[PDB]
Scaffold this active site. Structure first.
Site, PDB file in Angstrom:
ATOM      1  N   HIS A 102       0.807  -1.228   0.000  1.00  0.00           N
ATOM      2  CA  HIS A 102       0.000   0.000   0.000  1.00  0.00           C
ATOM      3  C   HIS A 102       0.835   1.270   0.000  1.00  0.00           C
ATOM      4  CE1 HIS A 102      -4.145  -1.382   0.591  1.00  0.00           C
ATOM      5  NE2 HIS A 102      -3.752  -2.179   1.568  1.00  0.00           N
ATOM      6  N   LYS A 104       2.677   4.565  -0.371  1.00  0.00           N
ATOM      7  CA  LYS A 104       2.706   5.553  -1.442  1.00  0.00           C
ATOM      8  C   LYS A 104       3.787   6.579  -1.129  1.00  0.00           C
ATOM      9  CE  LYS A 104      -1.964   4.341  -2.354  1.00  0.00           C
ATOM     10  NZ  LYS A 104      -2.078   3.223  -1.400  1.00  0.00           N
ATOM     11  N   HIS A 327      -9.577   9.504   0.301  1.00  0.00           N
ATOM     12  CA  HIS A 327      -8.683   8.377   0.168  1.00  0.00           C
ATOM     13  C   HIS A 327      -7.449   8.575   1.042  1.00  0.00           C
ATOM     14  CE1 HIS A 327      -5.792   5.617  -1.880  1.00  0.00           C
ATOM     15  NE2 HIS A 327      -6.869   4.856  -2.000  1.00  0.00           N
ATOM     16  N   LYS A 329      -5.687   8.731   4.715  1.00  0.00           N
ATOM     17  CA  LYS A 329      -5.895   8.091   6.014  1.00  0.00           C
ATOM     18  C   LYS A 329      -5.188   8.936   7.059  1.00  0.00           C
ATOM     19  CE  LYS A 329      -5.855   4.619   2.847  1.00  0.00           C
ATOM     20  NZ  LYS A 329      -5.946   5.059   1.438  1.00  0.00           N
TER      21      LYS A 329
HETATM   22  O1  OYR Z   1      -8.334   2.228   0.390  1.00  0.00           O
HETATM   23  C1  OYR Z   1      -7.170   1.826   0.189  1.00  0.00           C
HETATM   24  O2  OYR Z   1      -6.191   2.490   0.620  1.00  0.00           O
HETATM   25  C2  OYR Z   1      -6.957   0.517  -0.579  1.00  0.00           C
HETATM   26  C3  OYR Z   1      -7.795  -0.558  -0.307  1.00  0.00           C
HETATM   27  C4  OYR Z   1      -7.633  -1.768  -0.976  1.00  0.00           C
HETATM   28  C5  OYR Z   1      -6.615  -1.887  -1.899  1.00  0.00           C
HETATM   29  N1  OYR Z   1      -6.404  -3.117  -2.634  1.00  0.00           N
HETATM   30  C6  OYR Z   1      -7.327  -4.239  -2.610  1.00  0.00           C
HETATM   31  C7  OYR Z   1      -8.344  -4.521  -3.527  1.00  0.00           C
HETATM   32  C8  OYR Z   1      -8.739  -3.774  -4.650  1.00  0.00           C
HETATM   33  C9  OYR Z   1      -8.638  -2.385  -4.676  1.00  0.00           C
HETATM   34  C10 OYR Z   1      -9.050  -1.668  -5.797  1.00  0.00           C
HETATM   35  C11 OYR Z   1      -9.583  -2.340  -6.889  1.00  0.00           C
HETATM   36  C12 OYR Z   1     -10.060  -1.581  -8.137  1.00  0.00           C
HETATM   37  C13 OYR Z   1      -9.264  -2.038  -9.360  1.00  0.00           C
HETATM   38  O3  OYR Z   1      -7.950  -1.570  -9.201  1.00  0.00           O
HETATM   39  C14 OYR Z   1      -7.880  -0.172  -9.249  1.00  0.00           C
HETATM   40  C15 OYR Z   1      -7.332   0.247 -10.615  1.00  0.00           C
HETATM   41  C16 OYR Z   1      -6.603  -0.651 -11.382  1.00  0.00           C
HETATM   42  C17 OYR Z   1      -6.099  -0.255 -12.614  1.00  0.00           C
HETATM   43  C18 OYR Z   1      -6.333   1.031 -13.079  1.00  0.00           C
HETATM   44  C19 OYR Z   1      -5.838   1.426 -14.316  1.00  0.00           C
HETATM   45  C20 OYR Z   1      -4.768   0.744 -14.880  1.00  0.00           C
HETATM   46  C21 OYR Z   1      -4.270   1.128 -16.118  1.00  0.00           C
HETATM   47  C22 OYR Z   1      -4.883   2.204 -16.743  1.00  0.00           C
HETATM   48  C23 OYR Z   1      -5.947   2.845 -16.125  1.00  0.00           C
HETATM   49  N2  OYR Z   1      -6.394   2.451 -14.944  1.00  0.00           N
HETATM   50  C24 OYR Z   1      -7.070   1.923 -12.315  1.00  0.00           C
HETATM   51  C25 OYR Z   1      -7.569   1.531 -11.081  1.00  0.00           C
HETATM   52  C26 OYR Z   1      -9.693  -3.719  -6.862  1.00  0.00           C
HETATM   53  C27 OYR Z   1      -9.277  -4.433  -5.748  1.00  0.00           C
HETATM   54  N3  OYR Z   1      -8.910  -5.656  -3.122  1.00  0.00           N
HETATM   55  C28 OYR Z   1      -8.275  -6.075  -2.011  1.00  0.00           C
HETATM   56  C29 OYR Z   1      -8.485  -7.205  -1.202  1.00  0.00           C
HETATM   57  C30 OYR Z   1      -7.680  -7.432  -0.090  1.00  0.00           C
HETATM   58  C31 OYR Z   1      -7.891  -8.553   0.709  1.00  0.00           C
HETATM   59  C32 OYR Z   1      -8.475  -9.685   0.154  1.00  0.00           C
HETATM   60  C33 OYR Z   1      -8.691 -10.808   0.938  1.00  0.00           C
HETATM   61  C34 OYR Z   1      -8.313 -10.796   2.275  1.00  0.00           C
HETATM   62  C35 OYR Z   1      -7.725  -9.667   2.828  1.00  0.00           C
HETATM   63  C36 OYR Z   1      -7.509  -8.545   2.044  1.00  0.00           C
HETATM   64  C37 OYR Z   1      -6.681  -6.501   0.206  1.00  0.00           C
HETATM   65  C38 OYR Z   1      -6.521  -5.398  -0.626  1.00  0.00           C
HETATM   66  N4  OYR Z   1      -7.320  -5.229  -1.697  1.00  0.00           N
HETATM   67  C39 OYR Z   1      -5.777  -0.820  -2.169  1.00  0.00           C
HETATM   68  C40 OYR Z   1      -5.937   0.379  -1.510  1.00  0.00           C
HETATM   69  C41 OYR Z   1      -4.951   1.494  -1.857  1.00  0.00           C
HETATM   70  O4  OYR Z   1      -5.336   2.569  -2.372  1.00  0.00           O
HETATM   71  O5  OYR Z   1      -3.725   1.305  -1.631  1.00  0.00           O
END
Ligand code: OYR
Length: 437
Positions: A102, A104, A327, A329
């Site tokens: 995560h 950044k 977004h 925290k």
């Molecule tokens: O709110 C936060 O902070 C945070 C919370 C969760 C996290 N990621 C995460 C996710 C997850 C998050 C976001 C998506 C959306 C699709 O991708 C975004 C995207 C992708 C590509 C592009 C693109 C590319 C090329 C050109 C143009 N456009 C644009 C946007 C999909 C999925 N699903 C999870 C699940 C878990 C988990 C699962 C099981 C057990 C325990 C945990 C953990 C993390 N997961 C990231 C952030 C963040 O921002 O770091």
């Protein structure tokens, strides 16, 4: 101001509320330094978009993307970067299940020195368009002259602590950046680094990361005050993990306990959690699509309905950003009347055990799944006993710019936490649309 805490620019607020905000194009501008090389730590990337945010004269300088993607996701990222021969990638190891990279952070190496940027936005257009995001901008760190022997270290130990954070990756591209940091003087840094890295930490290493790192800093560098039990804890985040069957299993046992630490001496402390309601999202600048970046699944939520009694609406009139979904925290310790704060943290860490750590092995080991990074503002690091809360974010300067409204407002009886994978079809959003996942 000495804090160098900024919000990102929001398209669609009055210019008054973007005066002193930063777009990514501002951060990478030649006015901030003559770029030689950069590293971009993040979770997700739009590489075509990212390269266009660099000044044209800097677009062929080396870029390192530090990410946690595996398997087909990793292949997709490499395919994104393949057209750009100046882009290299570092895959952060995630050897504990269900972990995420995560963190950044930008490392910006200039002809003139070095800059570190710790922030909350993904490197995609939507994260910098109409969201509330936070940025800490380091000073321009000068190079230590060849032949000079000095630490370059700050009173907050930031230089060694950042190197330690990078060392945990065990990555050759990041050893190169460690050697760059070694050659620069970071002594003006007035924030403390708080990182999470994956692993199982025992003994002294327990205090290096996660909520035990926060607790250690608060014990060592903050003082307790009379009526300390009346000073609330505020946490504010965009994603919610599985916290357990009740508040005693993690939230109000070990997590709250680290958050309420002050000083070395040894609970009715109010805990306010700020997380967008469905109505917050529906009426936002983006409408329901803002909820695509507020990941809270129904499968997680239905197991912990007890948690939602802690939830307060997003409101940010102070920065003109009530309709710019968060977004960012943040975590902080306000006084009972919210006029002062004992500390403030901006971070990537959401409200999850994966991000902050969960105690294991009879309380002797802290297990962390994810990479996280934030910076902590402590009054002592500025010669102060507390910070006064800035009444209007963009309007003395020993006054800390809290970016949302205090006191936070409890959900109403008809409010619900935003849950991103169930439909909302009762009322349309600001673009005229419903939400059907
Ligand atoms: O709110 C936060 O902070 C945070 C919370 C969760 C996290 N990621 C995460 C996710 C997850 C998050 C976001 C998506 C959306 C699709 O991708 C975004 C995207 C992708 C590509 C592009 C693109 C590319 C090329 C050109 C143009 N456009 C644009 C946007 C999909 C999925 N699903 C999870 C699940 C878990 C988990 C699962 C099981 C057990 C325990 C945990 C953990 C993390 N997961 C990231 C952030 C963040 O921002 O770091």
């Amino acid at each position: 101001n000495p804090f160098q805490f900024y919000l990102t620019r929001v398209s669609g607020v009055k210019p008054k509320y973007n005066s002193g905000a930063l777009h990514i194009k501002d951060i990478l501008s030649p006015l901030f330094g003559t770029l030689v090389s950069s590293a971009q730590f993040n979770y997700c990337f739009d590489v075509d978009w990212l390269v266009k945010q660099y000044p044209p004269e800097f677009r062929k300088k080396p870029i390192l993307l530090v990410h946690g993607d595996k398997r087909e996701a990793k292949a997709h990222l490499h395919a994104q970067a393949k057209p750009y021969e100046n882009i290299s990638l570092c895959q952060a190891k995630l050897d504990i299940a269900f972990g995420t990279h995560h963190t950044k952070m930008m490392l910006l190496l200039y002809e003139e020195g070095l800059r570190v940027v710790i922030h909350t936005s993904n490197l995609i257009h939507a994260d910098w368009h109409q969201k509330t995001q936070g940025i800490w901008l380091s000073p321009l760190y000068p190079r230590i002259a060849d032949g000079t022997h000095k630490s370059g270290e700050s009173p907050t130990h930031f230089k060694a602590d950042l190197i330690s954070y990078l060392m945990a990756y065990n990555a050759p591209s990041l050893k190169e950046w460690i050697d760059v940091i070694h050659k620069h003087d970071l002594s003006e840094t007035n924030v403390y680094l708080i990182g999470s890295t994956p692993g199982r930490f025992q003994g002294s290493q327990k205090d290096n990361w996660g909520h035990f790192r926060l607790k250690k800093l608060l014990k060592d560098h903050a003082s307790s005050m009379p009526n300390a039990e009346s000073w609330p804890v505020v946490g504010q985040f965009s994603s919610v993990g599985s916290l357990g069957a009740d508040e005693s299993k993690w939230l109000c046992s070990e997590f709250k306990e680290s958050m309420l630490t002050l000083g070395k001496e040894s609970s009715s402390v109010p805990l306010y959690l700020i997380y967008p309601s469905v109505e917050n999202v529906r009426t936002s600048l983006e409408g329901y699509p803002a909820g695509g970046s507020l990941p809270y699944s129904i499968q997680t939520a239905e197991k912990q309905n007890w948690l939602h009694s802690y939830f307060h609406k997003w409101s940010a009139e102070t920065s003109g950003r009530s309709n710019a979904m968060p977004h960012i925290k943040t975590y902080m310790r306000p006084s009972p009347d919210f006029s002062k704060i004992a500390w403030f943290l901006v971070t990537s860490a959401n409200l999850s055990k994966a991000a902050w750590g969960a105690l294991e092995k009879n309380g002797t080991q802290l297990m962390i799944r994810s990479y996280e990074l934030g910076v902590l503002f402590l009054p002592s690091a500025f010669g102060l006993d507390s910070f006064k809360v800035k009444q209007k974010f963009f309007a003395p300067m020993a006054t800390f710019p809290v970016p949302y409204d205090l006191p936070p407002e409890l959900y109403g009886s008809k409010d619900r936490p935003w849950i991103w994978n169930i439909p909302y079809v009762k009322a349309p959003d600001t673009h005229g649309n419903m939400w059907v996942p």
